[PDB]
């Protein structure tokens, strides 16, 4: 009967950068999703496989909750099967993803008049990613021609990049926080219900 925390996932100050998204193994709950409509008017609340109007009365199992923060015009790459620099290098959902993608505007929280140089993404990599797997290693990207011997600059590139997140950018570049729930629905024990 104890409502397991969505507030420590949603209503938190620090959201992690997109190359290391958080994982909160949420289980043994009696979870009701009435709290999700009070916190913010959502920019994009899309679900895949279950409708939001019947989302309360099911009974899930192995529900995950992730968290990161990305740009404005590339929040639509957090979806099954999209292609870009986000969905191949930082966060890829599988093609049979069956949860819900929540993303609201957060320009007041995560934007300075100086450069908010904490939120970073990975831009260059050897190959693409598997679904649901992140890379946090900061080894130098080879440009493909000759070895750099761990030297940044020419013949190579430093694999990360920073966001600006200034309020004078506009709606396309101010930061959006993204919470993506991942139900692995219809298995045996079914510990989470409503």
């Amino acid at each position, epitope marked *: 009967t104890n409502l397991c925390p969505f507030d420590e996932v949603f209503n938190a100050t620090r959201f992690a950068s997109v190359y290391a998204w958080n994982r909160k193994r949420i289980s043994n709950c009696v979870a009701d999703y009435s709290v999700l409509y009070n916190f913010a008017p959502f920019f994009a609340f899309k679900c895949y496989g279950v409708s939001p109007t019947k989302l309360n009365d099911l009974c899930f199992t192995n529900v995950y909750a992730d968290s990161f923060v990305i740009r404005g015009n590339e929040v639509s790459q957090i979806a099954p099967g999209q292609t870009g620099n986000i969905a191949d290098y930082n966060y890829k959902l599988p093609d049979d993803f069956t949860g819900c993608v929540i993303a609201w505007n957060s320009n007041k929280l995560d934007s*300075k008049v100086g450069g908010n140089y904490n939120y970073r993404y990975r831009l260059f990599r050897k190959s693409n990613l598997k679904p649901f797997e992140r890379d946090i290693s900061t080894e130098i990207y080879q440009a493909g021609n000759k070895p750099c011997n761990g030297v940044a600059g020419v013949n190579c590139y430093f694999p990360l990049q920073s966001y600006g997140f200034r*309020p004078t950018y506009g709606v396309g570049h101010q930061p959006y926080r993204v919470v993506v729930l991942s139900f692995e629905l219809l298995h045996a024990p079914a510990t989470v219900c409503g």
Partner: antibody
Amino acid sequence: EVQLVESGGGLVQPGRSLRLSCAASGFKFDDYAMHWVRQAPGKGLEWVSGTSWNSGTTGYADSVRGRFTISRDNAKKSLYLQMNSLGVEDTAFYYCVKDSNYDSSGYLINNFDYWGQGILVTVSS
Amino acid sequence: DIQLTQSPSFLSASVGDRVTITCRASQGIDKYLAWYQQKPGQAPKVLIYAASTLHSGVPSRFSGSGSGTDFTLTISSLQPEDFATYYCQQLYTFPVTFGPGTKVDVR
């Protein structure tokens, strides 16, 4: 609620050194920032120092620049301010003040939310 | 850097009156400014952040307005607990600086 107890205040002589301390209890310390603000007995408020969630961006005022140094230690839920080469003008109540947003002054949602009781460090001798 | 000035420097208002306090900066700081209140002998507390949004716990009679360089703080119905001084605080960038102070005494 929010409980911020501070210690280290005492009568000292000019030219000495001392370390201020501030414990925290009742919130998540590493997610919120911290600052220090002093208030003279005759004057108003004046911002002393500021630190980030992980000491990423720290800045001081131009008056106490160099003489003071802040540090963050998330293990003990504590806060440290070290003052060196004090003058007679620094007799004030130092409030260990909890910020609200994660990092600093620039973000719109910044407000010095909870303020400690404050301790007087009086240096005249 | 940035300098904050307050006008007026003193007031004397009775119970039920309306008070306006002004606050100006040397440049445009773009709404990143707060307002605080200190009764003598205790700790200060938050009233309004970003000049238009109140913090939780205080009543809704408190309100601020304005943007750009000049800011106003007004209370429609003054109360006997509100007899204290009020400080500005700018929040554009480091270093943070405050206002000189305007106190509210009895009339």
